[PDB]
Amino acid sequence: VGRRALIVLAHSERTSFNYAMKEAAAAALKKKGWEVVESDLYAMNFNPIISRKDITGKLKDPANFQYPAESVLAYKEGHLSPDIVAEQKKLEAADLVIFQFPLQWFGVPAILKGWFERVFIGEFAYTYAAMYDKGPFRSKKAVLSITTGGSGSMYSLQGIHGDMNVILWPIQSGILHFCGFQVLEPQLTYSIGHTPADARIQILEGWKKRLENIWDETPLYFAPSSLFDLNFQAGFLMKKEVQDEEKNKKFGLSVGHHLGKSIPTDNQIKAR
Amino acid sequence: GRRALIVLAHSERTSFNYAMKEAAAAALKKKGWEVVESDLYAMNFNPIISRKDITGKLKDPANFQYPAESVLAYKEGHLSPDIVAEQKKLEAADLVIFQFPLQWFGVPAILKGWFERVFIGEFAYTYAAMYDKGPFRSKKAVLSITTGGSGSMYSLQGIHGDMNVILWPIQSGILHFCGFQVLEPQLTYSIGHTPADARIQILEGWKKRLENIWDETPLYFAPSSLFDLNFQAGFLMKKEVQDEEKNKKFGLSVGHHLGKSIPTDNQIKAR
Ligand SMILES: Cc1cc2nc3c(=O)[nH]c(=O)nc-3n(C[C@H](O)[C@H](O)[C@H](O)COP(=O)(O)OP(=O)(O)OC[C@H]3O[C@@H](n4cnc5c(N)ncnc54)[C@H](O)[C@@H]3O)c2cc1C
Ligand SMILES: Cc1cc2nc3c(=O)[nH]c(=O)nc-3n(C[C@H](O)[C@H](O)[C@H](O)COP(=O)(O)OP(=O)(O)OC[C@H]3O[C@@H](n4cnc5c(N)ncnc54)[C@H](O)[C@@H]3O)c2cc1C
């Protein structure tokens, strides 16, 4: 038939280049015969604050409210707030997920952060047995499309802000890969504010071009979960035999698993 | 008598995060600090940047840019009063404590929004005055964080990976960027599986530390003096400094690893 794509957009202005990148993605994907659903979080007045209101049933312990435990119960017995569930169904359906957002304070905008917090509930998006490469969304692929006010030099190894790979790690590993997503090379659009109109149109066409073969791309390297002892006991530590194999190597595995050594160049930006 | 701001991001008064706020205020008050609070949930604080944050005339309402418009609102003084009230607390405060649970490898959305709406240009940063030269270089800041997962999980060989990488974007990107001296974070691991007597220990430990918090050594960030601070050179590290560092085995910090090893616990323990 065709596969299905979810575009999540975090920008308030329809005049923005971020909006322009969303439209370009939908157009390009539709023309290749994808089905495209959107979550324009500002347009939806999406609520980013986790609270008791997210559960519309009886709480297990209302005297001691714990969002993790209560939210999982609500998922299982199916009395989550419908706004959460509607988003959960878009995700269940979608094969590719594009996150389009400007970099704000070295991370995702608050509204998108809240989306993750409310939508990526336990049992739906992760367990504990099933983390990282064994997680629920291992059939799916995800990609960050980001814009910055600062130039790329600033985010280079010798830039004032420091390595962009470090900045992407918490999002791409901690949120996306944790839940199982294969994470594709991020689409990084630097210093957009100082870019003339002809050059922006180029970037849009560049984005559209990439999306024609997005599914066939090689994803980023994360350390496989099979390198670790996955139980409470060993403390989710890297297996002793694997530590012995890596001891002699000059490079670490990833940005997080640098193991006190050098970080593989552009670990979070380019695929091997 | 100095002032302290405690920023708290947790909805429940029954939480350990609230308990840790209360212990901080008590301990600080007893040593004669003035303590102002921002309990963001209790305030029903709004985390979403919008046009509504400017209560005057927009420069260009047809083409709205929050950075430019918010700076003009600051200077001419027609920001939303909720934003301004928080900005005053910051102006006054010498120490800022951020008390929050780790959610998805970062700050909760409500605290993220606070940073987005309150840390406006000219107030909190320019890009003439970044990092060590920034507006809040007289002030000190400290993260107090709690996790569900155990510390092993966030160790060099842990499944989640190095905690230093996780803190970097927050402690460097937000706090130090604006000028704050950042103190050793207070990391409280796997709090839900800690027995009652041990939690009392942690509280007493927190209170003890706060008695001499001002005298502490802050974390090492690369000084701005190592870089050429203008558009032309591209805010790159100076050629002479690159030559100095070429022979060294370790990088400067987590973000300035320079393709080399990261100094151990750069974002967790002070030099
Ligand atoms: C709270 C906050 C925190 C921030 N933190 C950071 C940070 O940590 N690091 C950092 O680097 N930056 C930061 N920024 C800056 C931010 O990254 C930029 O403002 C943002 O990336 C700009 O993207 P945009 O889509 O809004 O651009 P816009 O300015 O909306 O768009 C660029 C230009 O393209 C034009 N345009 C729109 N549509 C089209 C089209 N179809 N064809 C051609 N031209 C078009 C627009 O009119 C405009 O002139 C921050 C900003 C805020 C508000
Ligand atoms: C959306 C989301 C994302 C998350 N992401 C992550 C993540 O990426 N990594 C991670 O590690 N964790 C994560 N967590 C888990 C979260 O970090 C923990 O639940 C939180 O840090 C625990 O703090 P709390 O105050 O809520 O604990 P609580 O359970 O409220 O408190 C802990 C215990 O202390 C007791 N207590 C309360 N007050 C006192 C007192 N005065 N004296 C003694 N005992 C007291 C309580 O009764 C309870 O038994 C996430 C949670 C959510 C909801």
Rounded distance, CA A12 to CA B128, Å? 28
B116 CB-near residues (< 8 Å, 6+ apart)? A104, A105, A109, A110, B47, B49
Which approach determined this entry? X-ray
Residues written for chain B: 271
Please give the C-alpha separations between residue B154 and each of B85, B158, B167, in angstroms, as whole numbers: 37, 5, 11
Best probe of the B interface among A14, A61, A105, A247, by most B CBs < 10 A, is A105
CB pair distance less than 8 Å for A166 and B254: yes
- The SS3 assignment for B17 reads helix
B259 CB within 8 Å of a chain A CB: yes
Please give the C-alpha separations between residue A84 and each of A36, A93, B22, in angstroms, as whole numbers: 19, 15, 33
Ligand 1 centre distance from Cα of residue B75 (Å): 21
A214 CB-near residues (< 8 Å, 6+ apart)? A96, A141, A143, A184
- The SS3 assignment for B133 reads helix
Does B192 qualify as catalytic in the annotation?
no
Work out the burial of residue B215: count CB atoms within 10 Å of its CB; fewer than 13 is exposed, 13-18 middle, 19 or more buried. Answer: exposed
B207 CB-near residues (< 8 Å, 6+ apart)? B23, B24, B26, B27
Whether residue A244 contacts residue A155, with contact meaning beta carbons closer than 8 Å, is answered with: no
Taking alpha carbons only, the member of B1, B6, B43, B7 closest to residue B26 is: B6
- CA-based radius of gyration for chain A: 20
Question: Using a CB-CB distance cutoff of 8 angstroms, which residues of chain A are in contact with residue B253?
Answer: 162
Protein residue with its CA nearest to atom 8 in ligand 2: B104
Rounded distance, CA B24 to CA B39, Å? 13
Whether residue B117 contacts residue B87, with contact meaning beta carbons closer than 8 Å, is answered with: no
Rounded distance, CA A254 to CA A223, Å? 7
The answer to whether the annotation marks B148 as part of a ligand binding site is yes
Provide the domain count of chain A.
1
Q: Which of A104, A111, A161, A194 to mutate to test the pocket of ligand 1 (most atoms within 8 A of CB)?
A: A104
**Resolution in angstroms for this experimental structure?**
2.7
Domain range enclosing B100:
1-271
- CA-based radius of gyration for chain B: 20
